[PDB]
Every structure is written in C-alpha cells, then in structure tokens.
Curated annotation (Swiss-Prot), chains A, B:
It comes from Severe acute respiratory syndrome coronavirus (SARS-CoV). The active site is at residues 39, 143. It comes from the Viruses. Exists as monomer and homodimer. Only the homodimer shows catalytic activity. Residues 1-298 are cytoplasmic. Cleaves the C-terminus of replicase polyprotein at 11 sites. Recognizes substrates containing the core sequence [ILMVF]-Q-|-[SGACN]. Also able to bind an ADP-ribose-1''-phosphate (ADRP). May cleave host ATP6V1G1 thereby modifying host vacuoles intracellular pH. Residues 1-298 form the Peptidase C30 domain. It catalyses: TSAVLQ-|-SGFRK-NH2 and SGVTFQ-|-GKFKK the two peptides corresponding to the two self-cleavage sites of the SARS 3C-like proteinase are the two most reactive peptide substrates. The enzyme exhibits a strong preference for substrates containing Gln at P1 position and Leu at P2 position. Signal peptide: none annotated. It is found in: Host cytoplasm; Host Golgi apparatus. This is 3C-like proteinase nsp5.
Length: 298, 298
C-alpha cells in the first residue's frame, strides 16, 4: 500500500516568503491577503516569552518583505488573527484557487506542501495525531508550510506549521490562526500528551489489505464494541465509538467483513503479535489512512 | 523519516486524456505533442498478442480523443515511437515547463503523479527496482501516469505507466517509449526477475537515521567491500560497487561515520536481526531513499 498525497499544484501558486528582519519563513497568498505564523516578528531571544501585541506595535508595513518568487509585493495592512499574521497586500493573486478554511479533527489526514523561503520543495501525506501533534520529521526551517485537502477544484486548507517541539514532533495552527492542541507559539516548557494509536485508521488499513490481497489476519471470532475498547485501552489505542462503526460501513460492504469481526481481527493482532508477517509489506500497524482515503484509492 | 515527493504542479498542466474507442487513459502534453502508451489502440481481446503496426494502419487521426479537461484538441499527426503513441496536435501547451527526458537507472527514485482519465488525483514517491519493476500498488486504471524528478525549474520526465503485472507489480517505459526491463506491452507470460534489495539506499537511510537521532545500530566493527558483498549475496541484496562508496562520501563526512563502518553496521543488522527495535519508526530496512534524496532533505 502506497501513502498518497494530493496534487500540490493549486497550493504551489499561493506560496510566498515573508521576511521580517533576520527571520524568513513561508506564507499563504490568497486574494489580496498573505498569511504566515505571527512568530515571524520575534527575534529568537524574544521567542522565550514574547509580548505579541507589544512586538507588533513597533512593526510597520515596510518591515515585512512579501515575495512571490521574482515579484516583490507591498503590505498595506498588517494585522494579527490569533496566532497568525494577516498581511493585506495591493495585488490579488491570479493563481488563487477556490479555497475554504477547515479545522480538521484528530485522526484525520492531510497533504503537506513543505516549502523553504517561499519556494515549494516537497509534498507528503500525514495525519493529525490524537495528542494534536504531527510526526512530520522535517518541517525544519519550513514554518508557514501548509496542510491541505482537495475535493475536485476546491482546496481545503487546514494546517500551517509553527513549531518543532523539543521531542521532534510538530505543532501548528488552522488557517484562522487557532492552534491544534493546548500549545502556544512560544519557546517554553511545552509537553505533548501521550499519543494513542488511531483505531479507526488501523481498521481502515486492514480493510484495504483485504481488497489488495492480504487475508491471513481474519478469523471466525467476533467481538462487540465493549470488549474491544477494553483491549484498546490496554494497548494505548483510541476507544472506538458508534460513529466510527458507521464510517466503516461502506468498506465492510465492499469486502464482506463486518466491522465488529474486523475489530476481532485487530483484537487478536494486539494480543498474539504478528510473528514477522507483513500486512501490506509492513510489520507494524499503520494508523495514518482514513476510511475516506481507502475508498478514494479503491 | 517521511517519504517526500516532488511538487506535482509543473506536471499537472501536462495531463490530458487520450480516448481511443472504448479505451481511455492518461497522456503527457508537451509543446504540440501528446504522449501516451501505444496499447490505447488495443481492444482487450487484441491485448493477448497485438500487431501494433497493423493496428495503427487501420487507425486514423479522428479515432483519438485528446482532452485537456474542458478543452478538446485535434490530432494532425499520429505516430509510433517504440512502445509510445506520439500524437501531433494543433495547439501548443501554454503550461509546458522546461522538460527533459531521462532514463533513470535501477535503484534511483522518482515522483509519480497518478491520474485517472486525464485528471490528476494523487502523488507519491517510489523507486525503480533492480528487476526494473515498481511496487506502485495502485496504478490500476491509471495507464499513462508519469514519473518525474525536478531540479529547480526543470522537470526530468523518466517514466510512463503501461502494465500491471500478474504479481501486482508495475511495468513501464521511459518517455522515448523504451521499456524498463525485458517486458513488452502485451498481456502474456511475463515473469519479473527475483527482486534484490537496493543496498546503497539502505546505507543512505541509515545515514539519515544518524542525522535525525537513531544511533544504536552503530558498532566499532569495520568491514571492507569484499566481506560485505559476500554477506549481501546471502541476504538477497545488491553487491556494493566502488562507485556507491564514492556517492556516500558527502553523507559520511556529515555524520563522521566511514562508509565501510556503515556497511559493517548493516552487515550486523542482517545476521543479528533487529529484535523489535525501530530505525526511524520502521521495523524493516527501507531501500527507497537515494543518498541524493537524503541530502536534499537535510
């Protein structure tokens, strides 16, 4: 099974660089507006505990260098939207697609277009963890990089990168400037919560394995939602709700395997191990595919 | 470690659909030319053993439906370039980037933009296997999808998809229409060779693990190129040449670990296992990252 990301084309045209002083990071250019993390105005020493309102008052419109590759723009209206810097520019982006800002729930997935100083360099698919972090490994020096989904023509922007936490995981915000999780944009004592495994996704990945060719992990045992969440609690998994059962419905019908029987197959994989056998070429239980990601690829 | 693919934007504009009869597949639109697999003219029953010259003679320019989303073009010059259908069109593509056709060596990597009926849907990073296949899992109904690399502005096209082999692996061609491997474009007895592991890439991935944080697999043993290729032959790995040693040079210098010492670290991982310990969150040895892919992300 291949981890697939959305075509990054519609997002690439919206990538600009915001340079404030010695700080340069990526920005999102939509209509006559440029979004970037508000920590761009902080000057490293100021990152320990910043006074953002105080720091913005001493910043003017000519302190921001918005650059769209060869073209340099101009700021006519600097503003602050929660943890985001909303920069009003003179020219509207001719490459602006149909866009909407959504706030994705934990367990859901998105494509990230990683850029470095306004120029896009790579694209990958990741998931929003239950503790609200992302395991993006390298978003280092890519602050401003965005997370998105695509439905035909419409781009659903949902993430902007802000922070690489002291434990190598990544923290960030939605496009309304509001953080995913309890985290602030401040270099301080920021402890991430104990990450659980996204159960729904594991079940979806197993449903995918059935469609491809792997079937050995299926047994004739059954298990209700009560007994399974008891075992899920033990192996640091997310408990499974009745809503998750309803979501897996279309994938149950396609493979002829009831969701509770699939839960019984998972229950067994946690207690009896895997014994060096690979589900879809992987020795571990992959939890970063939603049931909607499985259906769109099958 | 995250598997990163190139931004698909410059390639998305070149995606069209070629519809010949009941057969519809993806096409590459560059200048006043449209490339697609020549098996588009085959009519399923004809796929067992086709006579391509004979089949093309009874095909005219109005038998091909080239469509760029909303815009339908017209064929003025159908031709055959080895296993590729070269279609000359009236209008030149305004979205044509700087492009070059390269033939990638086995062990090297590329980004694939998977499309379905001319419209791009997903993007992922894969590798050209030693047996010349790709493990693309789902390129099903995506014939014509291209494989590429990007250097700043220049797009290096290197792959087009043709065949999903009876063993779930994928076969295809370069953009000059010449197949990677002994394979033909014919639904017949096509056996893929015994796939070996790309050693250079495993060494590169281990070098990457050192830069991130994992260091436990390093020991004080050393091993020359002779003793290692003896062990590599045993575990179905590629033998390591002196050229591969020279390629790993810049990554050796960055981590302070000599390539022969890294080979000694690998030698041990094959004979002593891994004992349920994860290198970069993975229980198996990942072989689809080139040393150039490691450097570009670090």
């Amino acid at each position: 099974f291949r981890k697939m990301a959305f075509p990054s084309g519609k997002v690439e045209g919206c990538m600009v660089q915001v340079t404030c002083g010695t700080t340069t990071l990526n920005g999102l250019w939509l209509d006559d507006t440029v979004y970037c993390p508000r920590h761009v105005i902080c000057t490293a020493e100021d990152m320990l505990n910043p006074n953002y309102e105080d720091l913005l008052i001493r910043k003017s419109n000519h302190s921001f260098l918005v650059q769209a590759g060869n073209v340099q723009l101009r700021v006519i209206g600097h503003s602050m939207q929660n943890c985001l810097l909303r920069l009003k520019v003179d020219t509207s982006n001719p490459k602006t697609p149909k866009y909407k800002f959504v706030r994705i729930q934990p367990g859901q997935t998105f494509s990230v277009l990683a850029c470095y100083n306004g120029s896009p360099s790579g694209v990958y698919q990741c998931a929003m963890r239950p503790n609200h972090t992302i395991k993006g490994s390298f978003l280092n020096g890519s602050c401003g990089s965005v997370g998105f989904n695509i439905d035909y023509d419409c781009v659903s922007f949902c993430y902007m990168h802000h922070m690489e936490l002291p434990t190598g995981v990544h923290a960030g915000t939605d496009l309304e400037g509001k953080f995913y999780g309890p985290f602030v944009d401040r270099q301080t004592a920021q402890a991430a919560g104990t990450d659980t495994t996204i159960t729904l996704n594991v079940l979806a990945w197993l449903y995918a394995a059935v469609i491809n060719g792997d079937r050995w992990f299926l047994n004739r045992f059954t298990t209700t939602l009560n007994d399974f969440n008891l075992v899920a609690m033990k192996y640091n998994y997310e408990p499974l709700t009745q809503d998750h059962v309803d979501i897996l419905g279309p994938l149950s019908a396609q493979t002829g395997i009831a969701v509770l029987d699939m839960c019984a197959a998972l229950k067994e994989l946690l207690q009896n191990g895997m014994n060096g056998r690979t589900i879809l070429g992987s020795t571990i239980l992959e939890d970063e595919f939603t049931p909607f990601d499985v259906v769109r690829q099958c």
